[PDB]
Amino acid sequence: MQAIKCVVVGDGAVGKTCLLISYTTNAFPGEYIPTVFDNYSANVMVDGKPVNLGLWDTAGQEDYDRLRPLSYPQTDVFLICFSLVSPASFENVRAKWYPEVRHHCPNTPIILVGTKLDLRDDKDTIEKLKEKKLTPITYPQGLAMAKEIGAVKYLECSALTQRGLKTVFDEAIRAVLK
Amino acid sequence: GSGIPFLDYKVYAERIFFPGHRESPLHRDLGVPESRRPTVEQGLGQLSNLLNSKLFLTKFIHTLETQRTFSARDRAYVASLLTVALHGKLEYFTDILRTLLSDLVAQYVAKNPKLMLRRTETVVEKLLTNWMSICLYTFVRDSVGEPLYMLFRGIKHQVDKGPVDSVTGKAKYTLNDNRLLREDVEYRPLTLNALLAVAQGVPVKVLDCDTISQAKEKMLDQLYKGVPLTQRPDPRTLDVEWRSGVAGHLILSDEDVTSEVQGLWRRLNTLQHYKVPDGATVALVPCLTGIRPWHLVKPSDEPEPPRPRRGSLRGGERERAKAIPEIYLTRLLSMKGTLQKFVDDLFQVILSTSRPVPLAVKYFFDLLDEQAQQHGISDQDTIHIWKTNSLPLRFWINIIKNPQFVFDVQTSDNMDAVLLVIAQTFMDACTLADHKLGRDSPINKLLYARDIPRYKRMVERYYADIRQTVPASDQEMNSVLAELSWNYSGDLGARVALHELYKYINKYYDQIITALEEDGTAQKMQLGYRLQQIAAAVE
Ligand SMILES: Nc1nc2c(ncn2[C@@H]2O[C@H](COP(=O)(O)OP(=O)(O)NP(=O)(O)O)[C@@H](O)[C@H]2O)c(=O)[nH]1
Ligand SMILES: [Mg+2]
């Protein structure tokens, strides 16, 4: 047995809590309640080895900035989350999340996760952004950010559909091993 | 409110007998090899029998007290060593006390008798403190413990209702003007759901301005309600764990990475710092392992002392002692009002006359009346001082000042500050000096100005009503003293007390030997040769 500490960071309402509930209990929560410092646990097999993956959910609100670095010590892998539909959450990776993670943990690996993949191709979501004069974050746009922040791997996933979600946590353990 | 943490007689006695030791010096190994073990113990055994000789013991104390090297510290220590050695012979202990008191009265009659028993700089003075403590233990347990604990919990409850600075010690609610938090800081009360992971939730009333350590202290008082300090765990061994949702896992501390640091200052982490809300589940889990700190108000370090003027007298009053502003005095007078019920109850129980008065109090006050009578002292004020400097200012005042002598509790700097004001009021109640009041007058006199006259009348009627009742005979007292000796099982350090007493005999041997040889009765009793046999047996 080899326990791995994992901290999921990102902007408000990006889909961090949803991503963790959809992976652990295999069901989507739906109801939106802003989390403060929730914790989740799941035992997953990666490369024929038993891993007791420790999940740490953080608050996306700038009001809870003070308590956030308490989850950071002794962490094995980080997950910077941004919404693929919201370009403000993508810009917040460079301006808020990446320098905050490196300030407390400069030798801990980071993986850039593009939350809400199902809403990227949806007709109703694009119309809402077209009126606000905003364009959704494509794969080469998100990959360029992951290279800029020095992330080991870039993955896109959706909590509602479960597409790519199983790969996100699988590649997370792989980063710790090497 | 069930559970009063009364100290067991052993701990009570040890704390009172050896106040400046932390741990009883009698609880140690002799430091003598096993070869000399039978010969030394036999010598110490013979010393115990020699201490039973009234002529020896009286001459032994008198010789020691005439020496320059035998300090006040020695005088108080030797008196406590004799107390432990003669704890089983309290009838005889009191006979030795009586003899030494008569010697003291005789000395003070020819000087100023109003100055007798004012301090604890003689053997007889410390012996009286120990004597009062032995007799009054049950009285404190049976009647005085209930109001005294009510005052302690009372202050603790009221001080907790407002902010307290972890660094400076300044509190919103206090009786001392010097400990008052002059700046009104922004604070909000919070009711935390406390858990003990060492389980069911217990509600704890705290404030957002409290430090993690301050929160932890308030948590432990409810999670260990009717539990004494000795049974309670060390606060440093426990961590404060805040938990939200399904699983929390967050550890809060006074100093960590989240700490607010600006320049040469570092603010201590509060509950408001982490943004802990009302109703939040906080658990106590075990610990698994330049820049100046501040909490509420930044400490004002002033280079205030200037070089004084040539002719200027300075004075510790009138100019330096500025009249307390009404804004701060109202805050102190409001605090006095909250603790009034507890203060009044305590002083009523201590000075109760309708309730049975302990025989020890009656007997000793009858002895002081008799000592004044034999020496022709008619001045009632002189007799008043004598009684005051036996029992209120010898025993009671120290118990008020420090509850750790009686209870198994922890005492904060502000708790000690509040109790001091109360103790000073109790002192003014027994004192005969009339104070006019004004400006530079002490804090206790200003706060208890409306109550002191009534308290003075309580002490006045206490001595008077005790006098009016049938005198207490020695036959009447030594009966209670005999059962007091039998009641206590032992293990107070008598063997080690005899060894520590020999060290003083070894120090002043030649001086003691002359006193035992100059006296005719001592020569016939062969007390000198007896002391030589013990000296030869030990070394
Ligand atoms: N269609 C779709 N909706 C999602 C997805 N992820 C999250 N949502 C929705 O977007 C909202 C945010 O969910 P949430 O997990 O709480 O985001 P969060 O970042 O953890 N909030 P916080 O920053 O306060 O911790 C919810 O209303 C949720 O139903 C997704 O992958 N697909
Ligand atoms: Mg959340």
Residue numbers in the entry:
A (entry chain A): 1 to 178
B (entry chain X): 1560 to 1757, 1764 to 1854, 1880 to 2129
Article excerpt on this structure:
Plexins constitute a large family of semaphorin receptors that mediate the repulsive chemotactic response necessary for axon guidance in the developing nervous system. There are four classes of Plexins (A, B, C, and D). Their architecture is conserved across the family with a large extracellular region including the ligand binding sema domain, a single transmembrane spanning helix, and an intracellular region that transduces signals to a number of downstream pathways. Plexins are transmembrane receptors distinguished by their ability to interact directly with small GTPases of the Ras and Rho family through their intracellular region. They consist of two domains, the GTPase activating protein (GAP) domain, first identified by sequence similarity to RasGAP, and the RhoGTPase binding domain (RBD).
Rac1 was rendered constitutively active by introducing a Gln61Leu mutation in addition to loading with the non-hydrolyzable GTP analogue GppNHp. We have determined the crystal structure of Plexin-B1Δ1 in complex with Rac1* to a resolution of 3.2 Å and refined it to a crystallographic R-factor of 20.7% (Rfree = 23.8%). The overall structures of Plexin-B1Δ1 and Rac1* in the complex are very similar to their apo-structures with rmsd values of 1.5 Å and 0.6 Å, respectively. However, there is some flexibility between the Plexin-B1 GAP and the RBD with the RBD being rotated by ∼6° compared to the apo-structure. Rac1* binds exclusively to the RBD and does not form any contacts with the GAP domain. The interface between Rac1* and the Plexin-B1 RBD covers a buried surface area of 707 Å2 and is dominated by hydrophobic interactions. Plexin-B1 residues Trp1807Plex, Leu1815Plex, Thr1823Plex, and Tyr1839Plex form a continuous hydrophobic patch that is complemented by Rac1 residues Phe37Rac, Val36Rac, Leu67Rac, and Leu70Rac. The hydrophobic interaction between Plexin-B1Δ1 and Rac1* is extended by two potential hydrogen bonds formed between the sidechain of Asp38Rac and the backbone amides of Val1811Plex and Ala1812Plex. For the one-to-one complex, Rac1* is positioned distant from the Ras binding site on the Plexin-B1Δ1 molecule.
